[PDB]
Subunit: 345 residues, 3 copies
């Protein structure tokens, strides 16, 4: 019945994104994706705390899927028999059947094939949703990612001008709820089922123990900082399937930001900090103007610095002293300074 | 002095809305409403937990009032002598005197009549606000609802096109703060005054025990699901007088969303999830495209699935396989599948 | 190298703002500011609770700096040797070097001079950010303020009309994390270093003990209410460097609101409540229409009434009974009232 070309896409692990065209003159296709559920213990902080995670394709977040408006997206969801739980998938980009969840419930040892038409442009969350209390549990165990539905003509500024990125990164933010014992130390378990009761008690209090990018504190710092160059226009997709976030690029801005993440709306310009409402993806474009290290955070700085939610960019290029300069390096306060006469003393 | 026709409105219990015109060619009127405060014990979850509630017109939320720009709204607020506390009303739609609170304080056995001019379009919270710590306590005990001030020409898309709904529902979301005893079980009390001290201690920690629509977990599921039909344009008004929320229609979208709730602003288009800042109402229009069950949640899924904040729509009509289809039903993973060669293993 | 006139600005304590032009025909200048770090114990609530604070210029928030687009801002940051900790400054308005933090780290006894070009219009947070866990700690200890970068032609409505304020106020909101002892009473310390470990434990749970405007509960009530007059257009700048807020003017509205705080975007009109994402400043214009007391809150009313986050305006002028009137003062419910036949009983 649907007589369109079929194109298989090979996903890649975040924060990288599978190759794609921004603008295209190709017509609609059936874009074929495979997502394999993997339950596994994972390391989620710099002290080595482990967690009974649940993932699409082995990562937190699940990988970013990219299609264009009018494409059909045919997803083979696989639940290997080494897993212990049923799983399914809800695409916030899709129309009907709880975004697909009501058509994709699979037990370990099964797979299912769902097709949805990409009628809505933007970045959108996808996540597991088995039913009842299992919905938040699978999501906050790691079972969420995002899909981007680009306009066929690529992005624009809402005022008739095309916008093109030189580089794209996907930042999935994950709130985690890790039990502690009476001594205050994080607990370890041998299976997700064994971890559940204690984890639900932490979840109920709506305060995460960790807030991480790309699955762990420090994932996108150190050697895995995100690269860019002065002059590049970088698209930063940010998702949060369960909980609000407030992204900020330290030392930069959001030149064009779709806070609610939907490209039929013009972006806002020149933001300091934006807001990803829990259950959504948003996107920001920034053209780098200065070299050096940038931090990229949620701007609850307690979350950023103390619960894991800091990434880095390492940007190559030449410094622009017109934009910013250190006029005088740190020096002893002059002896003839008169600061004791200032109004606030 | 004010020589306009008077029109008495009979309110109805949420999530339904009293009948009204969208567009009107009638001129301004004095629209007369009566709100009667009722303090009473109410059931707020599926396990039968009770709560010492305070309400306008016996419901959480209070009923939705609907008027047009330029109408005058004359509210008779009644505090029967069976109540124990003073009460008043703040209309976020109104100008002056703390939205009316400073002109409406009534003791049990009294009533008061306030008139406010509907100069500002949108959906707006109304709530009790007696003074001091009694303000949050009366609000989170249930004393809040909403008023909609429509443009006289009805809604529009911000780009010169009229928008008309076939159906309207009012979803009032309530954060509740229910004390627990040392064994961890919710406590019961014989009066609101007796519940207050323990409730304030829960309030102070800014973590609700329950987050509910229409006054209780499960209120809008089961037999009280919200009805719609494929093709209908449904307006979903959502209020939260004290605390943020992030609404999402599972399997749908917000075609047109006034997140901040004010019709002088164009709506955003094609949202997955929107954001109701605490202390406001917002509104979303969606044209149903597929039949079946939809969930409507706050997309903190812990709140949705575990604290009470899930409603259902039951939508009649014919399924559209172009928008979404199950290409292959659940089946055993083929023996010749090669998933062990995937990049993430 | 930079051959522009230099203009020294004398800052003033919030909520007031140093004098400035809205529109200007002067060209770019080097606008010179001095900020002096002051660590000190401060009183943060109406019961006299003290706190080991860290400030710019002795206040929470730090003072509002005002410049125009294209100016250069040359900041001398001073860390007197009476302080105990290193400090620095991040301007969210600036481009490069972590907003300046990477060029301004100074030990007690030192000062540094940073210049940044004001290329981005709006209101923006500035805050200390020494590194690692010290970043949130210095911020939530009080080391944050804001800078406003006005367009050279002043504000406009996004639709080609100039907007001019008669009056400006800066409301800095501060989330505080004050330890308690086993008896539940706030603890006192002799230095910030001594307070740190216990404070970090409170911070980690992401629930403030206090949420205050201008540094303390009650700061902007009583004799320090904010003054205005009927007819004045008042700009209310609101910042929150670490945590979301939802401002609301009780009895008023936001006529024009830049929620994300950036003047290249048109303001929203007629808001009831707006949203300051943590890590940002926003701004609202309101033309007062009625005299009397107004409250200005975050509309988590628990925070507003119970944790400190209420300010007042005292507005002089004549009451407008067309906008609002008390039709009938409180009176006993008429004996012939029939409220027992209402639908909700
Ligand atoms: O150690 N993780 O369960
Ligand atoms: O669920 N959000 O903060
Ligand atoms: O601006 N750095 O938090
Ligand atoms: O049982 N409610 O107080
Ligand atoms: O008060 N809001 O999350
Ligand atoms: O999309 N359902 O959470
Ligand atoms: O009393 N303050 O540390
Ligand atoms: O960090 N904000 O609620
Ligand atoms: O509208 N006063 O919360
Ligand atoms: Cu799952
Ligand atoms: Cu969802
Ligand atoms: Cu009341
Ligand atoms: Cu209010
Ligand atoms: Cu500091
Ligand atoms: Cu910052």
């Amino acid at each position: 019945d649907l007589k369109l070309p079929r194109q298989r896409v090979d996903l890649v692990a975040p924060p990288f994104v599978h190759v794609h065209e921004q603008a295209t003159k190709q017509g609609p296709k059936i874009m074929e994706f495979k997502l394999v559920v993997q339950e596994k213990k994972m390391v989620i902080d710099e002290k080595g705390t482990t967690f009974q995670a649940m993932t699409f394709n082995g990562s937190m977040p699940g990988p970013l899927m990219v299609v264009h408006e009018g494409d059909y997206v045919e997803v083979t969801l696989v639940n290997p028999a080494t897993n212990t739980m049923p799983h399914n998938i809800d695409f916030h980009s899709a129309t009907g059947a709880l975004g697909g969840g009501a058509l994709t419930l699979i037990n370990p040892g099964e797979q299912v094939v769902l097709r949805w038409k990409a009628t809505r442009t933007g970045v959108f969350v996808y996540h597991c949703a088995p039913g009842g209390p299992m919905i938040p549990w699978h999501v906050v165990s790691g079972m969420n990612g995002a899909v981007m539905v680009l306009p066929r003509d690529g992005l624009n500024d809402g005022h008739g001008h095309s916008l093109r990125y030189d580089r794209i990164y996907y930042i999935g933010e994950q709130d985690l709820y890790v039990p502690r014992d009476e001594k205050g130390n994080f607990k370890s378990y041998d299976s997700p089922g064994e971890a559940y009761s204690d984890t639900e008690e932490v979840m109920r209090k709506l305060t995460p123990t960790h807030v991480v990018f790309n699955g762990k504190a420090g994932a996108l710092t150190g050697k895995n900082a995100l690269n860019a160059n002065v002059g590049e226009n970088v698209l930063i997709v940010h998702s949060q399937a369960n909980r609000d976030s407030r992204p900020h690029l330290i030392g930069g801005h959001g030149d064009y930001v779709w806070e609610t993440g939907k490209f039929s709306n013009a972006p806002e310009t020149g933001l300091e900090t934006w807001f990803i409402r829990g259950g959504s993806a948003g996107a920001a474009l920034y053209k780098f103007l200065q070299p050096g290290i940038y931090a990229y955070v949620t701007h609850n700085l307690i979350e950023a610095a103390n619960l894991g939610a800091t990434a880095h960019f390492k940007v190559e290029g030449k410094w622009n002293d017109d934009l910013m300069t250190q006029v005088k390096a740190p020096a002893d306060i002059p002896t003839g300074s008169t600061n004791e006469n200032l109004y606030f003393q």
